[PDB]
From Swiss-Prot, chains A, B:
Pfam family, one: SKI
Natural source organism: Escherichia coli (strain K12)
Keywords, comma-separated and alphabetical: ATP-binding, Kinase, Nucleotide-binding, Transferase
Gene Ontology MF annotations: ATP binding; gluconokinase activity; protein homodimerization activity
Protein name (database record): Thermoresistant gluconokinase
Upper taxonomic lineage: Bacteria, Pseudomonadati, Pseudomonadota, Gammaproteobacteria, Enterobacterales
EC number: 2.7.1.12
Length: 172, 172
């Protein structure tokens, strides 16, 4: 049922760290399945969000379980499946891990100043520094004790992180 | 909550019509959001199918309702959203339509001989005739009364199918 020769990689990291760009390119070049985790939020969450209220860990819980389940499905028919999910808290990672031993994470790791300039570089985008601060505040970095976590250096042009991500995926 | 300025396109058609190959390349070229609808099956459907049994329409309902919420979520942040779902039965399509007035279908239309040839050209694939035959039996072509349906000619090279898809997407 779990297909141990198929693997799932959750692209994680704070907002602006490259999750969508990297994951978009990596799936293209690898012919891999690709799911953006934001699309699994229940109707409930989309409406809360539209109304400007910020989700809570109790709201994230149903979203994450659906993420879990979608990972379970993707691994039924693809050797390599990529999911985009910031996954800031260890506890979110545990919820994704459950029942998916063939799941691992690729942490797109960068420090604050690198990500900030990358967020600023978008024409017309009004940058609120506080948004990023909190991202980093919320971030619970996966340490070495989290052994299904691979880490990729973002202080690199898009092509590099894409390559490092590929290397990380192919490394076995 | 319905962003009436954003749109969702459900690429549909029988097995082998090209849904995946076309949606992939098209989302790539348009930088559109993309969801393979098979990834939204509830846990139980996956197991049921893991066990070798085919889904019945009761199984499909919650699958489709979840896909519906997924389209709902996608249109929140993407101007163009692609979803792959063969959606053969009118009923499945209504399930998708509900609460999504900004959703429409893109029918990858073509006949047996053409689809057959293509499935057969898969290297290593032992073509089983009955499969495709059942697909066509099950197909309830969207007639003119389904006004949210766009049609594309599959009897054209992939990249033309792509362009024709791109053309109907940009047509408005
Ligand atoms: N390594 C890179 N080098 C230069 N620019 C990059 C790199 N990676 C991503 N970018 C750009 O920086 C911005 C942030 O990337 P992206 O949208 O993928 O981040 P994200 O992690 O998905 O953010 P969010 O989680 O908020 O949706 C984008 O404009 C993207 O084009
Ligand atoms: N118009 C095209 N011209 C030639 N070959 C095509 C064309 N479109 C798709 N193909 C090829 O035909 C095969 C069927 O395509 P594809 O896997 O995208 O169909 P599908 O609708 O997603 O089928 P399924 O629902 O079974 O996954 C693929 O191998 C694809 O590479
Ligand atoms: Mg993103
Ligand atoms: Mg397909």
């Amino acid at each position: 049922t779990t297909n141990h020769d198929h693997h799932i990689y959750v692209l994680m990291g704070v907002s602006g760290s490259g999750k969508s760009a990297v994951a978009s390119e990596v799936a293209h070049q690898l012919h891999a399945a690709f799911l953006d985790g934001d699309f699994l939020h229940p109707r409930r969450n989309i409406e809360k969000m539209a109304s400007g209220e910020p989700l809570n860990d109790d709201d994230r819980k149903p979203w994450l379980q659906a993420l879990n389940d979608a990972a379970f499905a993707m691994q039924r028919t693809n050797k390599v499946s990529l999911i985009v999910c910031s996954a800031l808290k260890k506890h979110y990672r545990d919820l994704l891990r459950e029942g998916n031993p063939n799941l691992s994470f690729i942490y797109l790791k960068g420090d604050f100043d690198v990500i900030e300039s990358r967020l600023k570089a978008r024409k017309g985008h009004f940058f609120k520094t506080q948004m990023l601060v909190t991202q980093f505040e919320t971030l619970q970095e996966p340490g070495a004790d989290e052994t299904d976590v691979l880490v990729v250096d973002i202080d690199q042009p898009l092509e590099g992180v894409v390559a490092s991500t590929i290397e990380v995926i192919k490394k076995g």
